[PDB]
Design a protein around this nucleic acid. Structure first.
Ligand SMILES: [Mg+2]
Length: 97
RNA sequence: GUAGAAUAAUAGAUUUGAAAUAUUUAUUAUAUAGAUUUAAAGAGAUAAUCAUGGAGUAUAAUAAUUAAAUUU
């Protein structure tokens, strides 16, 4: 098996109720850095992806993240940017078939 | 210029399915292994630009008069 999720190896679970979900959402809304997706997953025996699907974090956090990303991008050299672009192009190509 | 219909894009509202091949789908770091790749100080070729040079080309008092031809 190559690059497969844990849910495929051991079947999907629908154990988590509505109240729990609500709680999770609330937590996400409250403190994203303390209650990050990974942490949530650990808590409720469930995928980070699932958590993400369930619950949007505070938009401020998202904005901050975006800013950070931008900063990182800026910090790049010329060559690296070009390389990144090339990679992106390659990725795009590799869904054509 | 105004009004109404057909289609496209963008935004909003209301629904929507889903634990979504997230031990990488999108993207960011660092490490350890490997593997490679990217020069232009100058140059070649081709083209163009600015020259140099003066081959080639036209002309040989360009007036006046004579005759013819062509337009007013
Ligand atoms: Mg080069």
């Amino acid at each position: 098996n190559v690059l497969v999720g844990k849910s495929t190896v051991n079947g999907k679970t629908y154990h988590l109720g509505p109240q729990e979900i609500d709680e999770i959402r609330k937590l996400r809304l409250d403190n994203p850095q303390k209650y990050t997706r990974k942490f949530l997953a650990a808590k409720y025996g469930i995928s980070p992806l699932f958590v993400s699907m369930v619950s949007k974090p505070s938009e401020q956090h998202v904005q901050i993240m975006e800013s950070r990303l931008q900063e990182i991008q800026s910090r790049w050299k010329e060559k690296r940017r070009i390389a990144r672009e090339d990679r992106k192009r390659r990725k795009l190509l590799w869904y054509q078939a």
